[PDB]
Structure 1
Amino acid sequence: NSQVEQILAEFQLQAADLKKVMRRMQKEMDRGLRLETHAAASVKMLPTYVRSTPEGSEVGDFLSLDLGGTNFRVMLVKVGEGQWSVKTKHQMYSIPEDAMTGTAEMLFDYISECISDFLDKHQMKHKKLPLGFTFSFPVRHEDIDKGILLNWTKGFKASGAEGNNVVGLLRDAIKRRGDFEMDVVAMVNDTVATMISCYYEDHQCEVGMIVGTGCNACYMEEMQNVELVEGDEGRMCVNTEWGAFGDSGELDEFLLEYDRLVDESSANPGQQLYEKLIGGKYMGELVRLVLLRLVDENLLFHGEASEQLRTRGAFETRFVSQVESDGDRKQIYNILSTLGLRPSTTDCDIVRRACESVSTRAAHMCSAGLAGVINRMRESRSEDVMRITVGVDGSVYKLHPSFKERFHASVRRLTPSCEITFIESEEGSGRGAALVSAVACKK
């Protein structure tokens, strides 16, 4: 146990580590905003064309598509005035591997089939509506309804997409199918969508964050600081793409053996390193690799590992969450037996410690990110204590039994001059795309 706890201790980050990360994130943000350094910035600070504007939208029905993982969502969002009301209906769709690792057209054809299914099941296929698209990958926006995919993240691979107008890809697929018509009026990031949906509930919400399969944030920047887009008046949402923080070496002093290994076998070696420390795509696999380290030292399972624990990806991140949901070891035993293992009573405690060590580092790394954003915003204003609302969506955050609590407390220590309200978005990644579309249509 002695030696377990010092192998596990490599995952600790001191206050001083977290402040260093925070400040470096603030300097990368700043690099990404300036024309002189934008092109070489690891933290891209992408203009979204979502602006501060008087409250209100068109009234009516709006479709939303939300693509950001293997599971995706179609939504019908009805905006009405009394005063305002928003009601939603959704369906979920799972994308087969074939459709994610083939061509862009195969991917967008599958998407359009699903839209078709949604419209059938809501007896509205004869209707032509405005559609907002939540598309959760790095995009260079040229307008609210136009954007070029820079690169796939989170293991997506469809060919023929990178470098192309993602909105064009959707619209072409819709037309190929010829079974329905929609006006694609807006495409946004999931961070952005989450923030808009949250703003609707709370006007102080000016940051969106995702801690899901990937990890990213967006926030409202002053237009004079957004040098890529002409104008000094008002604010525009910037999609930080903070996932790529570290991709210029900024994190090198913190990366562990397990981190290099996750990166090397990932779909995108050398990219999204910050996100690899945090996102649900990778947390379960980090844990897996730590559990193997403790085995090949004969500190775990008497040094015998199962077939499935030697198998990349078999420690799914939902396991990490379930482990930590356990004190009778029932939750831990039920995940471990699943894996072809026979834990002692001590192993169960060891696996729960390992989960904790990875999941805690994630919450801590993530808090430094968000603190960076929130402190920068405070500094750009007339704030003694800044009260701000953050919209947060993602499965790590919503479902991980203690990640959230750990994240909040770490965030608060790094932001001792702000009071932060975190709003857990029920379906903001999807609803927000509809609401942005409604605002866009009001033109």
Structure 2
Amino acid sequence: SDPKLTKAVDSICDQFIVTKSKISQLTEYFIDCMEKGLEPCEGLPMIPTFVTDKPSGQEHGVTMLAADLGGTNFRVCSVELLGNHEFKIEQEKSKIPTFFFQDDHHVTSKDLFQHMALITHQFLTKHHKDVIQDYKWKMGFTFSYPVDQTSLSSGKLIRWTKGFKIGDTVGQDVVQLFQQELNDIGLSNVHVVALTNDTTGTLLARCYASSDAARAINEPVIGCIFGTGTNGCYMEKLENIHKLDPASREELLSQGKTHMCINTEWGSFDNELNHLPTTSYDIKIDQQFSTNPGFHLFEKRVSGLYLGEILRNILLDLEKQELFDLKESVLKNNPFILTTETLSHIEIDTVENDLQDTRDALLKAADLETTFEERVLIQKLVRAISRRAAFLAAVPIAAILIKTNALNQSYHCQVEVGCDGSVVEHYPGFRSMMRHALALSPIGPEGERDVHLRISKDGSGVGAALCALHANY
């Protein structure tokens, strides 16, 4: 209907295409960054988590509690391990005040961890009134942030993310700080025994929830997240974790341990952009509309937070060319007004319904009245953004499986990949497009059929509880 605008959209969509050649390149380059990352500091982060055992699913008769500090909520839960892949969970939820995300000179780290301590006291008083001060509680702490973890219960914050501005916390042991405030309110009997990442929890949770005899050939190997951010972990041979001091590496091998879970934090993959597909829109977003410019570049191309923003910048560039009319819309100066959920309604909308689900999504999101011919092109852009995100999201998984020869161990060898996150859970077709990229990746179609992307929820709870199980009070 409008050949001028149409040709413009066709050109932009082609910039988001990820060819089989590129998947091979990025998969090979990812393994290179993996090995470089396993060396002493001077590649990927590659952070040892010090988790060496996998839950069997038969741990029972014990009750653990765990604390999870997300980006917008604080969470306290109690996980009763009942064995047979079943568990009871009770919890109390608390919001994080908004003044912690601004750089108020009056807000400090202590005020944050004191907030966490009081909620613990309020939660324990709610469900376990009789054992609040006597029980020898073992607590698992899920701190889904960049951390330089030196042991299972010691980790200093490296840098805040997800909109946080508290400088006094950086470079300080977050577990000890949290423990300092738990003693002050009279809960000295609560010992923070484990410091885990949310990916480490996603994996252990699926190990406990997996099947007894199916796991003889179907072993969970990766725990990853695809939501506001992205990150993944896997088990690595102790011999390859050169960051680990040899004494501790030797001590674990002599104890029957063979692997240790590595928190790759692959969101920081190829921060130099030697190979990641990049467009003027990814650059304009990385420098201006980013909270930590220059960091987590791979995450910004796959995170559900930035997917909506990418579309917005495309439309603004199209208005600059007098091709698209925003009229009374409110996109001109409203970053992140386009959300991952908004695009979801566009992904699966049908042209048989004049793309009605998309018109309403745009009106509700930015009062942007549209025509049928416009939504058809907007749909093409959304489907191209999601497809690149799903294709890139497959590279880390394929690289990890290749580097560990997980797919060729037995006659009927299969592997599971635990996933959690608004994108992979609910964004329509995301997993479907991931499986497609896995088929185009070096593992091949025969490799994908032996890979199962099963979703495992509540990693920050059961997973953190299991880490405290094998820890000493």
Q: Say which SS state the counterpart of residue 463 (structure 2) adopts.
A: helix
How much has 1:320 moved relative to structure 2? 2.0
Q: Structure 1 residue 352 and structure 2 residue 367: aligned?
A: no
Q: Structure 1 residue 436 and structure 2 residue 438: aligned?
A: no
How much has 1:32 moved relative to structure 2? 0.7
Q: Say which SS state the counterpart of residue 271 (structure 1) adopts.
A: coil
Contact 1:58/1:439, CA 8 A, preserved across alignment = no
| Partner residue of 2:163 out of 155, 158, 183 | 155
**Residue 317 to residue 21, structure 1, CA distance change in 2 (3 Å):** same
| Partner residue of 2:139 out of 128, 131, 135 | 131
Q: Say which SS state the counterpart of residue 169 (structure 2) adopts.
A: coil
How much has 1:57 moved relative to structure 2? 4.5
Distance in 2 (CA, whole Å) between partners of 1:120 and 1:346 is: 59
Q: Which amino acid aligns with 1:274?
A: F
Distance in 2 (CA, whole Å) between partners of 1:321 and 1:94 is: 26
Q: Structure 1 residue 220 and structure 2 residue 220: aligned?
A: no
Aligned to 2:3: none
Contact 2:199/2:459, CA 8 A, preserved across alignment = no
Distance in 2 (CA, whole Å) between partners of 1:384 and 1:439 is: 33
How much has 1:384 moved relative to structure 2? 7.9
**Residue 160 to residue 62, structure 1, CA distance change in 2 (3 Å):** same
Aligned to 1:263: 286
Q: Structure 1 residue 15 and structure 2 residue 41: aligned?
A: no
Distance in 1 (CA, whole Å) between partners of 2:188 and 2:373 is: 58
Bigger mean CA offset, 342-351 vs 364-373: 342-351
Q: Which amino acid aligns with 2:233?
A: C
How much has 1:205 moved relative to structure 2? 0.9
Q: Say which SS state the counterpart of residue 91 (structure 2) adopts.
A: strand
Deviations along 1:291-324, one digit per CA (max 9) or x if unpaired, are: 2222323333x35462345311211222122332
Aligned to 2:405: 378
Distance in 2 (CA, whole Å) between partners of 1:140 and 1:105 is: 20
Q: Structure 1 residue 398 and structure 2 residue 413: aligned?
A: no
Contact 2:202/2:457, CA 8 A, preserved across alignment = no
Aligned to 1:170: 178
| Partner residue of 2:223 out of 198, 201, 208 | 208
Contact 2:224/2:230, CA 8 A, preserved across alignment = yes
Q: Say which SS state the counterpart of residue 49 (structure 1) adopts.
A: coil
Bigger mean CA offset, 125-134 vs 367-376: 125-134
How much has 1:33 moved relative to structure 2? 0.8
| Partner residue of 1:70 out of 66, 69, 72 | 72
**Residue 178 to residue 222, structure 1, CA distance change in 2 (3 Å):** same
Q: Say which SS state the counterpart of residue 251 (structure 1) adopts.
A: coil
Contact 1:79/1:86, CA 8 A, preserved across alignment = yes
How much has 1:26 moved relative to structure 2? 0.5
Distance in 1 (CA, whole Å) between partners of 2:271 and 2:390 is: 20
Contact 1:297/1:303, CA 8 A, preserved across alignment = no
Aligned to 2:50: 49
Distance in 1 (CA, whole Å) between partners of 2:457 and 2:55 is: 24
**Residue 71 to residue 407, structure 1, CA distance change in 2 (3 Å):** farther
Q: Say which SS state the counterpart of residue 193 (structure 2) adopts.
A: strand
**Residue 117 to residue 412, structure 1, CA distance change in 2 (3 Å):** farther
Q: Structure 1 residue 316 and structure 2 residue 331: aligned?
A: no
Q: Which amino acid aligns with 2:198?
A: D
Contact 1:73/1:430, CA 8 A, preserved across alignment = no
**Unaligned runs of at least 5 residues, structure 2:** 1-5
Q: Which amino acid aligns with 1:198?
A: R
Contact 1:212/1:397, CA 8 A, preserved across alignment = yes
Q: Which amino acid aligns with 2:95?
A: S
Identical-residue share of aligned pairs (%): 29
Bigger mean CA offset, 318-327 vs 9-18: 318-327
Q: Say which SS state the counterpart of residue 291 (structure 1) adopts.
A: helix
Contact 2:235/2:261, CA 8 A, preserved across alignment = yes
- How many pairs does the alignment contain? 435
Contact 2:54/2:207, CA 8 A, preserved across alignment = no
Q: Say which SS state the counterpart of residue 20 (structure 1) adopts.
A: helix
Distance in 2 (CA, whole Å) between partners of 1:50 and 1:182 is: 21
**Residue 341 to residue 53, structure 1, CA distance change in 2 (3 Å):** closer
Q: Structure 1 residue 239 and structure 2 residue 263: aligned?
A: yes
How much has 1:91 moved relative to structure 2? 3.6
Q: Which amino acid aligns with 2:384?
A: S
Deviations along 1:32-55, one digit per CA (max 9) or x if unpaired, are: 1123xxx243x0111110003674
Distance in 1 (CA, whole Å) between partners of 2:320 and 2:185 is: 54
**Residue 389 to residue 170, structure 1, CA distance change in 2 (3 Å):** same
How much has 1:10 moved relative to structure 2? 1.0
**Residue 176 to residue 40, structure 1, CA distance change in 2 (3 Å):** same
Aligned to 2:360: 334
Contact 1:139/1:149, CA 8 A, preserved across alignment = yes
Q: Which amino acid aligns with 1:65?
A: A
Contact 2:54/2:204, CA 8 A, preserved across alignment = no
Q: Structure 1 residue 279 and structure 2 residue 280: aligned?
A: no
Aligned to 1:191: 199
**Residue 119 to residue 379, structure 1, CA distance change in 2 (3 Å):** closer
**Residue 115 to residue 334, structure 1, CA distance change in 2 (3 Å):** farther
Q: Say which SS state the counterpart of residue 100 (structure 2) adopts.
A: helix
Aligned to 2:451: 420
Bigger mean CA offset, 102-111 vs 234-243: 102-111
Q: What TM-score do you get using the length of structure 1 for normalisation?
A: 0.91
How much has 1:215 moved relative to structure 2? 0.6
